[PDB]
Structure 1
Amino acid sequence: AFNQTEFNKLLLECVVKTQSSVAKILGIESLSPHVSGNSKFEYANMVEDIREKVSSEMERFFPKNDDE
């Protein structure tokens, strides 16, 4: 008897907790002295790149237009 609900609860807790934690690790890493002056790892540049990636995948699976 596979408990899909409990599996979903664990899955969600893990992925939400991981994303919230990784967002902080990304900010801390952006402040590291060995990437100062490296445009690729400037925090605003990273956030924009991540935003574009997430938005494009979301648009593939959950398009704003439900009748393309």
Structure 2
Amino acid sequence: AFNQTEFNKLLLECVVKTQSSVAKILGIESLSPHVSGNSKFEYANMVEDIREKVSSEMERFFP
């Protein structure tokens, strides 16, 4: 049978692992020489943009 608990475990492990991994990739890419001196691709600036997008999507489902 399809175990829902196990499914949830794998599901959550993947998405948390991927977000943490992608944060680090974002960090490395922000430092890439070809986008240096571009305020569009400064880590703090991108993090702000991202958090804003998350907020507006979360507020939609979770008041």
Task: Give percent identity, aligned residues only.
Answer: 100
Q: Matches of 1:60 and 1:33 in 2, distance apart?
A: 38
**Bigger relative contact order (CA 8 A; separation at least 6):** 2
Could you say what the CA RMSD is over the residues aligned between the two structures, in angstroms? 0.7
Normalised TM-score (structure 2): 0.94
Q: Matches of 2:9 and 2:46 in 1, distance apart?
A: 30
CA shift digits 1:40-65 (9 cap, x unpaired): 111111000001001111100101xx
Query: Max radius of gyration: which structure?
Result: 1
Q: CA deviation at 1:11?
A: 0.3
CA shift digits 1:13-53 (9 cap, x unpaired): 00000001101110111000000111211111100000100
Could you tell me which runs of 5 or more consecutive residues in structure 2 were left unpaired when the two chains were aligned: none
Q: 3-state DSSP class of the match of 2:37?
A: coil
Structure 1 segments of 4+ aligned residues over 4 angstroms from their partners: none
Compare the two structures and name the one with the higher helix fraction: 2
The number of aligned residues is: 63
Normalised TM-score (structure 1): 0.88
Q: Partner residue of 1:66?
A: none
